């Protein structure tokens, strides 16, 4: 745990959770969103909750703007050094048409900006993790959920046999405690990060008690 | 009473049978794809081969004009009457990734997205019809989303179209022994592959299952490919 | 291709019954598998009537828990007849035994659902292996665990002779329906109208259809799904 | 406080792994297979293994006598209390026909039978975590499905009385149980083992039907 892990959503809950979780683990976590207000926020709490953290990097951003981000990423790398560490935690954003493209746009298009980039920087390295974190119209919803799905599923494949893992996370719902906890995510990921370097989880369905029946 | 039959990718391949078999069956078939010279002649061999069908309708069109896909298709509707059937068998299409990825998605998932709502309008006025999608490598993800996609649009609207007396059944085919398979990179003998005529007849099949028999997909597999 | 014999288990009445009339129309001489001789020729009396031109039914009352009986009838009839074409598995799903313990009940279950139609199997693949062709169609359908354990046990077991058979030129299809309309529904108490659900025919005429597909064309399953299910 | 983890295939690979792992951690670990002496080796290793830790309970059992079975968990549960964990670690024991009867009585009707038990125990307690490690004719193919269609049915049965179940689904793990082709860099039973010991701290309403293991080697 020693390297950069950079977070999207790093401001707001889930996001938030896992930066200051993987931040008292030793990584140098990169937060990603636009409030220079939520961020810092943020920044402040982890370290100001550590006796010793190598403190947060604030970069804000929007990263649906894909070619600023692809950039504010590359000199986050060239400044400090590798990322070991990707964690897709932005929440989703749910005339028709227009409106569809425009969902595809912002919850495919520019995640597929930011692993495009991470993932460049990571096969050089020959080594990463990439963790993603899902929930679970005419199709809209659907459509978007499943497209994100079929691009992890992809890069699982492609990217597994040059030493880069991808574990894409499903829980229902997440913050009333009859939900599933942030730190229930955050721990699963310690666990992956620690299990046998030639161990591959595609993905893991969280479902709550309730929901069952 | 057989009403209309629209199929995009109607110019070729697996298109191109399903139109000539759902004509010969006895509907008015709407023949969408981009160039008006290639769906003349699916219309011309229809025609020729057919003693007594209702002439195919000639679409020229880029469905990724959604807005003139809709009004074309709204004014064969308001013109010929009922649309009983939507066949999606357009072809998967494959200097920076990212603009390329949104020209992918552009074509083979929002322009679908806009035909099928075009459609669906129409057909849930109607407490009626049958909607095929006739799916089918590293690359940083691209394909697999945009396959994704396509399945999470369908899996979606088989749920949301059942109630309203509307279903939808995706077929999933490896290699289809047709010209486009040939010019694709296909390793297999023709014989090898799936038909175009599988396809076709278990369409047949599906039309003809009673009212309230739901069937959301059918995975076809290549006996070649599991021994392999 | 002159059409064969095609063996259809649970035949006098249900899924079966209806599979085993359409077969017969089709063309093919169908075998009349279940233990009651009562209600096999009762089927085998209304195939007749409905087409007196068709090959007559062979009625084989059989109780297919009885592996070995099962076995030697099938091979004569083999011997006999030629050529067999098809195998229908659509013997109904024996879900309860009224015993005191239930692990015992288990056993039972097991051993009339899986081991059984692990007999059937094993008898005409082995017939279809020699020929190198034909084709299997399987009609699916707080236990403590009971129920989906012998459910899954019958795909684990389709799913793997599917993969098996298929270079030996043998097809295997697994048709699973919601609720069909037939007498049995009716004995189960369905609480759907008639129209409301899945038609015997639906699975009959999609059979028909897989017959038809091309030589090298698999399809391991088909889902069917009531409209209502779905609604619902 | 910690109480009993019952684990099956104890004397041996994974379990064995497994059941010094939970041992380690507080659980007071019985331990069943045939091998009495073999039970005894996973015993004293834990013992001087830690420097406390519950005395693990040595069960010489074959699970397929089910009534016996059935009554040596009672009275374990009789005389130690509450079951915490239950891990079905066991292998796959692999005329046909009668022979393919014989595979589901020892893998499939056996299970079934331990369940039963620890499920009544379970029920009683609203509590309780349930761990499944997972040219033939279909037989193999058969028993592993029948496992997970009753680890899936009991899933959804016992969620909503307090009880939790989990399949671990690894490739290639590596344990000496390596009668039969990769070298060493197979999924280690340590990881297993720690992916239990994540579960079992998730919140109580978290739910997780199964997990996938996969050899970074299996994908080409």
Not at 1 to 22: D, E, N, R, W
Not at 48 to 73: F, G, M, W, Y
Not at 128 to 145: C, E, L, P, Q
Request: charge should be negative.
């Amino acid at each position: 745990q020693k390297g950069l892990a950079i977070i999207t959503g790093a401001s707001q809950g889930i996001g938030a959770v896992i930066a200051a979780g993987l931040a008292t683990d030793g990584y140098r976590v990169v937060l990603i969103a636009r409030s220079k207000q939520n961020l810092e926020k943020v920044h402040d709490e982890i370290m100001r909750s550590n006796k010793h953290v190598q403190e947060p990097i604030v970069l804000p951003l929007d990263i649906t703007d894909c070619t600023k981000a692809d950039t504010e990423i590359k000199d986050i790398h060239q400044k400090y050094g590798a990322v070991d560490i990707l964690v897709n935690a932005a929440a989703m954003f749910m005339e028709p048409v227009d409106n569809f493209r425009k969902i595809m746009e912002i919850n495919v298009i520019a995640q597929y900006g930011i692993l495009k980039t991470v993932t460049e920087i990571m096969k050089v390295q020959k080594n990463g993790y990439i963790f993603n974190v899902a929930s679970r119209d005419g199709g809209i919803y659907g459509s978007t959920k499943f497209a994100l799905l079929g691009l992890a599923e992809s890069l699982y494949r492609e990217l597994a046999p040059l030493g880069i893992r991808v574990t894409t996370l499903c829980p229902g719902w997440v913050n009333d405690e009859e939900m599933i906890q942030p730190d229930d995510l955050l721990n699963t990921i310690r666990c992956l990060l620690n299990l046998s370097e030639n161990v591959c989880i595609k993905d893991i369905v969280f479902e709550m008690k309730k929901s069952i029946i």
